[PDB]
């Protein structure tokens, strides 16, 4: 699969991946900066801790940086 990957936020080949994801969570700067954002690819939709948001998708470049 092809996915956007942080920190570069470029489209990269993940030949062994099947999903792209967008992961968001509050670090201790959340009040000043909003949520942290991680973009990656995985073999399967990653499992995450309760206060972490993850959205998985299965099309090339389906996880662009969430600007809107």
């Amino acid at each position, epitope marked *: 699969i092809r996915c956007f990957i942080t*920190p570069d936020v470029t489209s990269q080949a993940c030949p062994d991946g099947h999903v792209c994801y967008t992961k968001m969570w509050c*670090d*201790n*700067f959340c009040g000043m*900066r*909003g949520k942290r*954002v991680d973009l990656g690819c995985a073999a399967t939709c990653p499992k995450v801790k309760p206060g972490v948001n993850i959205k998985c998708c299965s099309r090339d470049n389906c996880n662009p940086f969430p600007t809107r």
Partner: antibody
Amino acid sequence: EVQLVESGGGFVQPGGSLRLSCAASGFTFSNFDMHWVRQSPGKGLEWVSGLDHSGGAHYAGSVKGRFTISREDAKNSLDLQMNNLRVDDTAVYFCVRGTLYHYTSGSYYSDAFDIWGQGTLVTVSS
Amino acid sequence: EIVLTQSPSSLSASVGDRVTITCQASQDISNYLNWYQQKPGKAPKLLIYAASSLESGVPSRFSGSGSGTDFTLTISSQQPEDFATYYCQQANSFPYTFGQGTKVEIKR
């Protein structure tokens, strides 16, 4: 596998020069702020110099006029030209990556030093 | 420059002890405060950024707290792996400055 590998360490008389180099692998080097941090038993950890992803250089007052930081993005290398060396420059020098954290509000650099090289010894003595 | 002073400079702990290390800044640095761990002959390792945010893989016994001029690193259950020197570091303003280090030694 993210790596910083230092070279160019050595020893000189006071007033001598050395050039440290750091080879970066496993990340897009040009995207990151890069720094040099030194350590001696008597100075603890001391930030020396930083060269931001925008080409902006910063220096500790202790090295101003004597040290020059540079990078060659095409060669994934960061250098520290050390001139007019003083005995109190004797230290282990670490090549260090500044953090690059993404938030909904944008891109933040050098909050912390997340990747450190093994360090290379510089000795200045008569 | 901003001066960070850690207390104590060294302490002795048993395995499973609660260890607390403080870092005091010469001026307000909001939460621009990191903690590093360093063992002899090794580079420092980043454990905590933004005063309280753990890096990936850092075990839950590590926590950070504070803001402004006063910060605390707590190791709630000291492990053999945790005997090391700890440094705070401010990223509020140039130059970046570190505390003097706190060495955690094994009590026997």
